[PDB]
């Protein structure tokens, strides 16, 4: 019983080249060169997909810090004050207030400022 | 009013045929004959022979006798069956030579 390995082999070739539709040059026409690259595309997907969590937190701190400095409180201490008021609210949405609803973020810096100790550098 | 003709297995390499067919895209049919007429390239002879069938088909088959409202709608050259022969060269070796052919198509439509 001889088996011609054409109906079986093509099954993965089309799968890769469908994932490869889009690559520039020779990575989107040739199975071998396309299958070396969709391996790299998946590994980069994994890394960047797990590393956009810190990417977005970086973007939120930038916005929080920019808005906080508009109200004369550095991001260094605006967070500590928030901790000492137990009003923990995620950065995801704490930075969503600074952009749209300035008043709400302005109302939260007020709380964070009053929850700080009088002299912030004296021994705890 | 799309009417078209084409010559198949015309013995001229596709690139050499495209060199001339790329002149005659989108001009008046008669104005294209007057360009292939005074064209140095040797491919301009088969191409103009196909451009005349397209006009002849337009006049006869579809009854559009007036060949002055026509422009080249489509014109393209497709690859054809390549022939393969050898050439003796230095020190007993042999390099291949491909005699390429082409399929020339021309389409004339009413303006």
């Amino acid at each position: 019983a001889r088996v011609k390995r054409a109906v079986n082999a093509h099954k993965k070739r089309r799968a890769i080249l469908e994932q490869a539709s889009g690559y520039r040059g020779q990575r989107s026409r040739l199975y071998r060169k396309a299958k070396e690259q969709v391996t790299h595309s998946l590994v980069y997907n994994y890394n960047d997909r797990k590393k956009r969590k810190g990417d977005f937190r970086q973007l939120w701190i930038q916005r929080i810090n920019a808005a906080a400095r508009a109200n004369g409180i550095t991001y260094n201490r605006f967070i500590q004050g928030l901790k000492a008021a137990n009003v923990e609210v995620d950065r995801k949405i704490l930075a969503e207030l600074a952009v749209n609803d300035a008043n709400a973020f302005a109302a939260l810096v007020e709380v964070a400022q009053k929850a700080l100790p009088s002299d912030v550098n004296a021994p705890k | 009013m799309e009417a078209r003709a084409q010559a198949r297995y015309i013995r001229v390499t596709p690139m050499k045929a495209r060199r001339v067919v790329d002149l005659i895209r989108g001009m008046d049919a008669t104005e294209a004959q007057a360009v292939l007429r005074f064209a140095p390239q040797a491919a301009s002879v088969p191409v103009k022979k196909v451009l005349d069938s397209a006009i002849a088909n337009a006049a006869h088959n579809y009854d559009h006798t007036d060949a002055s409202s026509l422009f080249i709608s489509e014109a393209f050259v497709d690859e054809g069956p390549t022939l393969k022969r050898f050439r003796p060269r230095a020190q007993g070796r042999a390099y291949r030579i491909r005699k390429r052919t082409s399929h020339i198509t021309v389409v004339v439509s009413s303006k």
């Binding site: 040059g25 020779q26 | 690139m15 060199r19 001339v20 790329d22 002149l23 360009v35 005074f38 064209a39 390239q41």
Partner: peptide, 24 residues
């Protein structure tokens, strides 16, 4: 000399565009 790599499709076509005939 010898070609070191197969010329990429972009680079090949950049050049052949220059091999065009002029309208008389």
């Amino acid at each position: 000399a010898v070609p070191k790599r197969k010329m990429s499709r972009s680079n090949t076509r950049h050049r052949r565009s220059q091999w065009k005939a002029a309208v008389p």
